[PDB]
Ligand binder design. Structure first.
Ligand SMILES: CNC[C@H](O)c1ccc(O)c(O)c1
Ligand SMILES: CNC[C@H](O)c1ccc(O)c(O)c1
Ligand SMILES: [Cu+2]
Ligand SMILES: [Cu+2]
Ligand SMILES: [Zn+2]
Ligand SMILES: [Zn+2]
Lengths: 153, 153
């Protein structure tokens, strides 16, 4: 298996730890961990193109989109590679993350390692919001915490 | 051609920002930037194996060493891929980083993206210190600041 990891931090209360594991080359990737400091409800959760945190999470650029598709949800055919949908925080402000995804990878052109994982202010509408921005960002709003995805032991 | 970036964080603050550029995949990598908050003198400067900062800089593991060599300086044949020598801080606590290196890469087996850059407490003796630990770490001591090396625009 191949593994990766991301420590999420920002300017406010949101912080988290996310692990990635890919059992076989080009296979599905398990994504799991925890994020705290969130408002209760859905928060957009995406891999953004650049692993650049120079000026904070803004430096990461748009959703990782090597195939030049429109924004969608993780279970849509029309999605960005980085479109991992939403995480859900409960009234503890904690999102317990447990995802399996078949489009991200830890190698090749779909590789997310060296890019930035971001948790957003608002829900991602998965491209179903009916304004222009829905099919670009999902209307998920600002970036609360982020980190560069790194190679893990 | 290809670019990467690393935000170093670390108490002091020891903080920095380091840029990487490789004009072609078969070619040297320019490494430049600034680190502040340092004590005057040499500080070991290495790429470590893992881009894991789960528990801080310790989680990054040993120097990146894909070829199973002993520790050295960047000019040596016998070196780790991650061996970038020392940065040298003045009384003002600032090290100006300007390195060109032909062993690290931003693509291929020696790719450093997704791994951790670390600035250390003490000087790296470049493998010439005479104890055993010179041949593993250069006796550069603890990890003052680190960050995961990410893909840049
Ligand atoms: C921590 N164990 C992860 C598990 O081996 C696993 C589950 C689903 C996957 O798609 C995968 O690649 C790996
Ligand atoms: C980028 N993700 C590829 C996916 O996990 C995948 C693996 C094998 C296949 O045959 C396939 O059609 C898709
Ligand atoms: Cu996002
Ligand atoms: Cu080091
Ligand atoms: Zn998207
Ligand atoms: Zn070394």
């Amino acid at each position: 298996a191949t593994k990766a990891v991301c420590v999420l931090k920002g300017d406010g209360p949101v912080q988290g730890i996310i692990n990635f594991e890919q059992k076989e080359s080009n296979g599905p990737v398990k994504v799991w961990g925890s994020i705290k400091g969130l408002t209760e409800g859905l928060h957009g959760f995406h891999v953004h193109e650049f692993g650049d945190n120079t000026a904070g999470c803004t430096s990461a650029g748009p959703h990782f989109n090597p195939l030049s598709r429109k924004h969608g949800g993780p279970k849509d055919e029309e999605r960005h590679v980085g479109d991992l949908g939403n995480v859900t925080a409960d009234k503890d402000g904690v999102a317990d993350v447990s995802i399996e995804d078949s489009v991200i990878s830890l190698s090749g052109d779909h590789c997310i390692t060296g890019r930035t994982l971001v948790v957003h202010e608002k829900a991602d509408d998965l491209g179903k919001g009916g304004n222009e921005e829905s099919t670009k960002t999902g209307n998920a709003g600002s970036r609360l915490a982020c980190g560069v995805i790194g190679i893990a032991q």
